[PDB]
Chains A and B, each alone.
Chain A
Amino acid sequence: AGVSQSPRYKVAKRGQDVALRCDPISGHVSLFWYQQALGQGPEFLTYFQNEAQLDKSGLPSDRFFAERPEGSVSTLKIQRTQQEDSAVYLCASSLARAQGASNTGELFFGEGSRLTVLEDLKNVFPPEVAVFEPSEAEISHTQKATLVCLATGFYPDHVELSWWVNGKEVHSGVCTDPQPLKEQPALNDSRYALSSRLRVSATFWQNPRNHFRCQVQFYGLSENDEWTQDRAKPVTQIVSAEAWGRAD
């Protein structure tokens, strides 16, 4: 039972309209919209009590408009999107019932909708993924084996890295960078690079029947978006790199 926000990621051309959806938890009377910029807390935009928009004081401009016609699903519409609109739009719902015992009266948030507004979509690139096999020197010294994954040259920062071992996703022994590196920090609006590590025991890496894979989920362009470049359309895709266990 959760709040569903869609699209989770959105690349948009400056001057174009964008529509964000929020499917709250059934029965929740309260629905709140928030905007969140990098290194800042969520900022109130508008609030709904069923289909009525009782407070919309937080809306940035004339161009932001929200609606909840049947008092369930809400849609935040941004018109003539500008670069300053790039943020994470958060949506929350609350039961709005009297709080007694066991009633938390809490706000249930969605996953968020990351919006990135660009002048030209000619700057959008998918990641390039590579897997680097463990150091024999580490296997001998520690009896542990670290795999490193390098996702490079992607733009914008719309990626989701994950490690897969024998068809199943792994979380234990994993760590991915919280933020990515600029491939050219001096150059304005450069492509990114992100690394991740997976640590297993020497014995698990030394079994050749064990298959390891780094999977990066990129969120780029859609069928509706226009592409007039000779290079391949930088659409939403999975870019991956694998590695098999080496015995010795």
Chain B
Amino acid sequence: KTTQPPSMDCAEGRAANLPCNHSTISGNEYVYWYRQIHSQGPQYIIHGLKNNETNEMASLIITEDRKSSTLILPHATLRDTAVYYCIVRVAYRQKVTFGTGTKLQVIPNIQNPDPAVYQLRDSKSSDKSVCLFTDFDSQTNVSQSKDSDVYITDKCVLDMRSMDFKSNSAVAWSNKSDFACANAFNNSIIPEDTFFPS
């Protein structure tokens, strides 16, 4: 009987306050939070039936009113992009019911973007190519294609841990000859200063 917003955007490095509503949360009803990454099963984060808990990953605050709870992620990392589930469990009950949860989207902080569109060549073929729209800030959003034989993936962020660098990226490809590097991401609002080499 928990209610949580279906989606939530959070800036990388900031605190993520994940709200959860439950009418009762009795003296012995618990509050458990689970995290779920793509193609994986849920993982325990924190729990608490009364006293607000502060473990090594997150912090749980139950209102003294007890009709709502909030999960605090002090500094949101990219690794924190997951579906967060708020579950209530009466002490003696074993069955755990999951709702739809909150889709937390940790927006990467791109410090020095140099948006550009580069053309990549196949290792084992002749003019089998992809177009890569990279290094744009997170405020940019990559749109799908109108053309049936033109495939465009959505934005994806990579972390070069050693160098301490994060970059946003998108790929486009097609078999048709009309397809060019300069007009692959035309259906998208790309920054006016996007670098187009030739």
A/B contact in complex, CB under 8 angstroms: yes
Give A residues with C-beta under 8 Å from B: 3, 30, 32, 34, 40-44, 47, 49, 55, 90, 92, 94, 96, 99, 104-112, 114, 130-135, 137-138, 141-142, 144, 146-148, 150, 172-179, 181, 183-184, 186, 193, 195, 197-199, 201, 241-243
Q: State whether A137 and B197 are in contact (beta carbons under 8 Å apart), knowing that A106-B44, A109-B43 are contacts in the complex.
A: yes
Complexed CA–CA distance, A107 and B123 (Å): 46
Give B residues with C-beta under 8 Å from A: 32, 34, 38-44, 47, 83, 85, 91, 94-101, 114, 116, 118-125, 128-130, 132, 134-135, 148, 151-154, 156-163, 165, 167, 169, 171, 173, 195, 197
On chain A, the residues within 8 Å of B38 by CB distance are 178
Complexed CA–CA distance, A178 and B83 (Å): 13
| Contact present for B95 and A47 (CB under 8 Å) | yes
Complexed CA–CA distance, A172 and B134 (Å): 17
Q: State whether A173 and B94 are in contact (beta carbons under 8 Å apart), knowing that A41-B85, A112-B40 are contacts in the complex.
A: no
Complexed CA–CA distance, A135 and B98 (Å): 46
Interface of A is mostly: strand
Q: State whether A174 and B158 are in contact (beta carbons under 8 Å apart), knowing that A135-B118, A142-B135 are contacts in the complex.
A: yes
On chain B, the residues within 8 Å of A176 by CB distance are 156
CB distance from B195 to the nearest CB of A (A): 7
A-B contact pairs, 8 of them (CB 8 A): A30-B94, A41-B83, A47-B95, A135-B120, A141-B114, A146-B132, A177-B154, A201-B163
| Contact present for A32 and B96 (CB under 8 Å) | yes
CB distance from B5 to the nearest CB of A (A): 14
Name the contact of B169 in the complex, choosing from A3, A30, A105, A197 (C-beta under 8 A). A197
| Contact present for A132 and B129 (CB under 8 Å) | yes
CB distance from A167 to the nearest CB of B (A): 18
CB distance from B140 to the nearest CB of A (A): 16
- Per CB-CB distance, the 7 closest pairs between chain A and chain B, nearest first, are A109-B41, A135-B118, A106-B44, A132-B120, A137-B197, A175-B158, A41-B98
On chain A, the residues within 8 Å of B41 by CB distance are 3, 90, 92, 109-112
Complexed CA–CA distance, A130 and B97 (Å): 43
Complexed CA–CA distance, A138 and B95 (Å): 54
| Contact present for A44 and B95 (CB under 8 Å) | yes
Complexed CA–CA distance, A146 and B167 (Å): 11
Complexed CA–CA distance, A137 and B91 (Å): 61
| Contact present for A40 and B123 (CB under 8 Å) | no
Q: Which of B128, B160, B161 has the most CB of A within 10 A?
A: B160
On chain B, the residues within 8 Å of A150 by CB distance are 130, 171, 173
CB distance from A77 to the nearest CB of B (A): 20
On chain A, the residues within 8 Å of B153 by CB distance are 177, 181, 195
Name the contact of A175 in the complex, choosing from B32, B119, B157 (C-beta under 8 A). B157
Complexed CA–CA distance, A199 and B134 (Å): 11
Name the contact of A43 in the complex, choosing from B98, B160, B171 (C-beta under 8 A). B98
On chain A, the residues within 8 Å of B160 by CB distance are 144, 172-173, 199
CB distance from A44 to the nearest CB of B (A): 6
Q: State whether A148 and B47 are in contact (beta carbons under 8 Å apart), knowing that A41-B100, A44-B95, A173-B159 are contacts in the complex.
A: no
On chain A, the residues within 8 Å of B94 by CB distance are 30, 47, 49, 94, 96
On chain B, the residues within 8 Å of A147 by CB distance are 120
| Contact present for A132 and B130 (CB under 8 Å) | yes
Complexed CA–CA distance, A3 and B43 (Å): 12
Q: Which of B39, B40, B129, B163 has the most CB of A within 10 A?
A: B39
On chain A, the residues within 8 Å of B95 by CB distance are 32, 44, 47, 55
Name the contact of A111 in the complex, choosing from B40, B134, B148, B173 (C-beta under 8 A). B40
Name the contact of A141 in the complex, choosing from B32, B169, B197 (C-beta under 8 A). B197
| Contact present for B123 and A197 (CB under 8 Å) | no
| Contact present for B98 and A148 (CB under 8 Å) | no
Name the contact of A138 in the complex, choosing from B118, B128, B154, B161 (C-beta under 8 A). B118
